[PDB]
Amino acid sequence: DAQPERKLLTPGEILNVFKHISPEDCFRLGFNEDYARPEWMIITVLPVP
Amino acid sequence: TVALREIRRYQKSTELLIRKLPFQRLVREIAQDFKTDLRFQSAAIGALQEASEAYLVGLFEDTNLCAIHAKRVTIMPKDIQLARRIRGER
Amino acid sequence: LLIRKLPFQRLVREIAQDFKTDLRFQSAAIGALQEASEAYLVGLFEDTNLCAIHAKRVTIMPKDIQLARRIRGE
Amino acid sequence: RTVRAELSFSVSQVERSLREGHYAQRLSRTAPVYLAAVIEYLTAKVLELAGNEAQNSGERNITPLLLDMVVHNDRLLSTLFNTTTISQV
Amino acid sequence: NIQGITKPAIRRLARRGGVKRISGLIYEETRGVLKVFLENVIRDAVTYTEHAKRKTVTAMDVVYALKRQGRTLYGF
Amino acid sequence: IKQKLETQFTCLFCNHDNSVVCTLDKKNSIGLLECKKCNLSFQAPINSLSQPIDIYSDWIDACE
Amino acid sequence: SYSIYVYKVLKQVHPDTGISSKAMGIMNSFVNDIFERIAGEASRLAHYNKRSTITSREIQTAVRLLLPGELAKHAVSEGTKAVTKYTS
DNA sequence: CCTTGGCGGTTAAAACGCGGGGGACAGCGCGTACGTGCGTTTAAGCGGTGCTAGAGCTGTCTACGACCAATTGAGCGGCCTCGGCA
DNA sequence: TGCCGAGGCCGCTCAATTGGTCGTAGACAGCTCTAGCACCGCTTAAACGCACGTACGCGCTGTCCCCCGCGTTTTAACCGCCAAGG
Ligand SMILES: [Zn+2]
């Protein structure tokens, strides 16, 4: 047994990790390179209706 | 004969002869008796096991020589009680 | 000291000549060598004795000395 | 100075280690060249035998089993490794 | 416990050492020699860890503890 | 089976909060408080009804 | 640290034979050990004579002290025939 | 409909009793070469001046290499171009 | 036929060079210490033979505890099931 250090996984931290996912692994995860790219689930600019 | 066979084999190889898990438990137990919940790098325990097995093997060489000196083929307590004394361990 | 000191000095100067030439020795240097040598030999004889007794031999033999020296890593 | 002395170890990096080890207050002009030359000799004597034993046995690379078999054999340098233990892990 | 150093692991080690036939009163002795060796090396490894203000005994603390017994260990 | 639980209690010595771990061994009726920081350890008896607040209460009275 | 030069000497002594990745760490711990032993011993030498500069002479003596016999002879001949080739 | 509290099911091997069968521990017999206390005589060992000087101890003097401070050149990693094997 | 493997160019970070202090390292002198090497008188310590004894070693015996194989079986350690809650 060892002392674990759980730190918060901020959106910005996760955002950079997602852009480095390869196209071949993007497909295998059921996402889609043209229409549903996985880093687009994080919001950086909000559309104003 | 099978004894000789094993000696030809083990002396040929270099894998650790004590089970990993058990050794990890012994080390952590003993260490726990000096300082509570001490965390260990895996390499630390590995270092301890390499050192311990090299030590025991050498000890068994000397022990063997002590047994053979007394015209015996079987290692006993009087062998180690002698090897370790001459080593300055006791 | 149990060895004639002078003999330890002779032997010493002889051995030393084989390493470096025209050497001189302080008397205390030779004395140091003799204390060390005799202490070493005495301890060795203790261990040898233990080997002999181990082999139903309380009386040291060359075999005993050789075992002792092998286990010492000498 | 390493190619100029026709050596293979850097007199520089080792000298930097000496500065960082703080083994003295001031080094000499030619002390690290001697220490790198001497060290270089020990590496080119151990690896010369590891490369002799890899081709004597028939091995291609050099494994730690080759180092453990050589340095405890070869009474030339087995005295340097009386009290060493190659981990093999 | 020390009982994890089993009978056939001490026998295997003896086989590596060159022992032919081994008497029964040697495993306990080995268990008692191995425990002394670990109590001498782990004390120094824990001393280097408490000196380094750590809580994890790394492998270089074990290499330093074996170096303080004339048992230098290469590969860590 | 033992229960290893983290708590939101403050260690009475090092004062780090949310760093006290409680190990309750009901098979032998022995509860164990541990810090994760200074790692001070405290043992106390537990029943079958006890919870991390029961031994942490016994630790407050064992100091005072 | 010293692993980049072990392979560079190995290319001279055996340009055909390669080396593993654990054996490089073993040769690197061997080099950092015989370095911190020769420099340590040399440091002891510079203190016993109350000097302040480690010259090549304290390295030649620490090589004579540490290495036994023919390894010290060869060790002192390679350092001497490297310092002389250096000064020229 | 989904994920933890404690519980069977999941292996490499040893917890080896215990059936078999023999290497070899310690006491006992004989049995021989070597082996030290005491004995002789000795050649070196312990303690004293006499003589003679090498270099350590301690003092102040003169001195050359490192510390930390501004310059600035080569090795290495990230772009970026060139090129023959598939 | 053409793009990823390798060498070249542009930045990064640490190494190399130069100039002023600066106390410590090297020189050097005065001078007393214990090591210098040569001879006496006496003595504790050493070279060589003895011999009946205790220890050192070889051979045969008992019975006896580790020797080798098999089988599940159990801790320790990796993979799936009971039926309560939110
Ligand atoms: Zn605390």
Swiss-Prot record, chain C:
Full-protein interval shown: 61 to 134 of 136
Effect seen on changing residue 2 to R: In BRYLIB1; uncertain significance
Modified residues annotated as N6-acetyllysine in this record: 20, 56, 63
Protein purpose: Variant histone H3 which replaces conventional H3 in a wide range of nucleosomes in active genes. Constitutes the predominant form of histone H3 in non-dividing cells and is incorporated into chromatin independently of DNA synthesis. Deposited at sites of nucleosomal displacement throughout transcribed genes, suggesting that it represents an epigenetic imprint of transcriptionally active chromatin. Nucleosomes wrap and compact DNA into chromatin, limiting DNA accessibility to the cellular machineries which require DNA as a template.
Keywords: Acetylation, ADP-ribosylation, Chromosome, Citrullination, Disease variant, DNA-binding, Hydroxylation, Intellectual disability, Lipoprotein, Methylation, Nucleosome core, Nucleus, Phosphoprotein, Ubl conjugation
Modified residues (N6-lactoyllysine): 20
Protein name: Histone H3.3
Family: Belongs to the histone H3 family.
Modified residues (N6-succinyllysine): 20, 63
Residue positions, PTM N6,N6,N6-trimethyllysine: 20
A GO CC annotation given for this chain: nucleus
Modification sites for N6-(2-hydroxyisobutyryl)lysine: 5, 20, 63
Modified residues (N6,N6-dimethyllysine): 20
Consequence of changing residue 53 to V: In BRYLIB1; uncertain significance
Predominant location category: nucleus
Protein's gene: H3-3A
From Swiss-Prot, chain D:
One MF term in the entry's GO annotations: structural constituent of chromatin
Region Docking domain, annotated ranges: 66-89
Keywords of this entry: Chromosome, DNA-binding, mRNA processing, Nucleosome core, Nucleus
Keyword 4Fe-4S appears in the UniProt entry: no
GO (cellular component) term, any one: euchromatin
GO biological process: heterochromatin formation; mRNA processing; nucleosome assembly
Signal recorded as keyword: no
Subcellular location as annotated: Nucleus; Chromosome
Chief site of localization: nucleus
Tissue-level expression: Present in mature sperm.
Coiled-coil stretches: none
Extra information: In contrast to other H2A histones, it does not contain the conserved residues that are the target of post-translational modifications.
Role, per record: Atypical histone H2A which can replace conventional H2A in some nucleosomes and is associated with active transcription and mRNA processing. Nucleosomes wrap and compact DNA into chromatin, limiting DNA accessibility to the cellular machineries which require DNA as a template. Histones thereby play a central role in transcription regulation, DNA repair, DNA replication and chromosomal stability. Nucleosomes containing this histone are less rigid and organize less DNA than canonical nucleosomes in vivo.
Assembly mode: The nucleosome is a histone octamer containing two molecules each of H2A, H2B, H3 and H4 assembled in one H3-H4 heterotetramer and two H2A-H2B heterodimers. May be incorporated into a proportion of nucleosomes, replacing one or more H2A molecules.
Domain notes: The docking domain is responsible for the weaker heterodimerization with H2B.
Family membership noted in the UniProt record: Belongs to the histone H2A family.
Name of the gene: H2AB2
Swiss-Prot record, chain E:
Mutagenesis / variant outcome for changing residue 7 to T: In TEBIVANED3; results in early developmental defects when expressed in zebrafish embryos
Modified residues (Phosphoserine): 23
UniProt-annotated location(s): Nucleus; Chromosome
Cross-link (Glycyl lysine isopeptide (Lys-Gly) (interchain with G-Cter in ubiquitin)): 67
Annotated phenotype, changing residue 67 to E: In TEBIVANED2; results in severe early developmental defects when expressed in zebrafish embryos
Modified-residue entries (N6-butyryllysine), positions: 7, 20, 53, 55, 67
PTM annotation (N6-lactoyllysine): residues: 7, 53, 67
This protein's GO CC annotations: CENP-A containing nucleosome; chromosome, telomeric region; extracellular exosome; extracellular region; membrane; nucleoplasm; nucleosome; nucleus
Cross-link (Glycyl lysine isopeptide (Lys-Gly) (interchain with G-Cter in SUMO2)): 7, 35, 55, 67
Disease the record associates with this protein: Tessadori-Bicknell-Van Haaften neurodevelopmental syndrome 1: An autosomal dominant disorder with onset in infancy, characterized by poor overall growth, microcephaly, hypotonia, profound global developmental delay, impaired intellectual development, poor or absent speech, and characteristic dysmorphic facial features, including hypertelorism and abnormal nose. Other variable neurologic and systemic features may also occur. Tessadori-Bicknell-Van Haaften neurodevelopmental syndrome 2: An autosomal dominant disorder characterized by poor overall growth, microcephaly, hypotonia, profound global developmental delay, impaired intellectual development, absent speech, and characteristic dysmorphic facial features, including hypertelorism, abnormal nose, and wide mouth.
Protein name: Histone H4
UniProt lineage: Eukaryota, Metazoa, Chordata, Craniata, Vertebrata
Curated annotation (Swiss-Prot), chain G:
Cross-link (Glycyl lysine isopeptide (Lys-Gly) (interchain with G-Cter in ubiquitin)): 85
Localization, UniProt: Nucleus; Chromosome
Record GO cellular component, one term: nucleosome
Residue(s) carrying N6-acetyllysine: 50
Keywords associated with the record: Acetylation, ADP-ribosylation, Antibiotic, Antimicrobial, Chromosome, DNA-binding, Glycoprotein, Hydroxylation, Isopeptide bond, Methylation, Nucleosome core, Nucleus, Phosphoprotein, Ubl conjugation
One GO BP: antibacterial humoral response
Modified residue annotations for N6-(2-hydroxyisobutyryl)lysine: 8, 11, 22, 50, 73, 81, 85
N6,N6-dimethyllysine PTM positions: 22
Modified residues (Phosphothreonine): 80
Modified residues (Dimethylated arginine): 44
Family statement: Belongs to the histone H2B family.
UniProt name for this protein: Histone H2B type 1-J
Species of the source: Homo sapiens (Human)
Location of this fragment in the whole protein: 37 to 124 of 126
